[PDB]
């Protein structure tokens, strides 16, 4: 329990300022989340853009230099690998 | 200007509840932003994982079925294309 004895007007003024600051923060974080979501969608489109080529390259090597192109498709690259 | 005449205690109680709700919202949006940032990093690693294969496949086709593998690398795929 604080030993400060504030007036009711001063505490109301403090609460209005905290509410104002919290609303400003909430809208800023919400707008940043929207911008980060759009950059996340762009990264996903680029990922699917790249994978669409690897998938078609695998189909070309399947029906038949061409050999080690397959090894790259299923190679472990820095902790990640495409399973069978 | 509202025609309501509230007591100072009732308005303080209302302000404390709004501050409590705003702080809860701010922490929830902040935690969601952290989770979305981790999923965004995973998408970026997967994108770079895929591109690392396309880059090495281009190097293999450069030094020399192999023909149309290059066409796929530089093909326009649903509004996106890798420039020269």
Curated annotation (Swiss-Prot), chains A, B:
Residues 43-84 are annotated as: DCTN1-binding. Residues 65-82 are annotated as: Interaction with SKA1. Acetylation at Lys-53 by KAT2B/PCAF promotes dynamic kinetochore-microtubule interactions in early mitosis. Crotonylated by KAT5 during mitosis, promoting astral microtubule plasticity and dynamic connection between astral microtubules and the cortex during mitotic chromosome segregation, thereby ensuring accurate spindle positioning in mitosis. Decrotonylated by HDAC3. The modification N6-acetyllysine is found at residue 53. Ubiquitously expressed. It is found in: Cytoplasm, Cytoskeleton; Cytoplasm, Cytoskeleton, Microtubule organizing center, Centrosome; Golgi apparatus; Cytoplasm, Cytoskeleton, Spindle. Composed of two functionally independent domains. The N-terminal domain forms a hydrophobic cleft involved in microtubule binding and the C-terminal is involved in the formation of mutually exclusive complexes with APC and DCTN1. Homodimer. Heterodimer with MAPRE3. Interacts with DCTN1, DCTN2, TERF1 and dynein intermediate chain. Interaction with DIAPH1 and DIAPH2. Interacts (via C-terminal residues 206-211) with APC (via C-terminal residues 2674-2843); the interaction inhibits association with and bundling of F-actin. Interacts with CLASP2, DST, KIF2C and STIM1; probably required for their targeting to the growing microtubule plus ends. Interacts with MTUS2; interaction is direct and probably targets MTUS2 to microtubules. This is Microtubule-associated protein RP/EB family member 1. It comes from Homo sapiens (Human). The chain holds residues 210 to 257 of 268 of the full protein.
């Amino acid at each position: 329990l604080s030993n400060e004895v504030s007036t009711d007007e001063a505490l109301l003024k403090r609460y209005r300022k905290e509410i104002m600051d919290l609303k400003k923060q909430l809208e800023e974080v919400s707008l940043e989340t929207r911008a980060q979501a759009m950059e996340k969608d762009q990264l996903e489109k680029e990922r699917d853009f790249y994978f669409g080529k690897l998938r078609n390259i695998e189909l070309i090597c399947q029906e038949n230099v061409l050999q080690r192109i397959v090894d790259i498709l299923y190679a472990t690259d820095e902790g990640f690998v495409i399973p069978d």
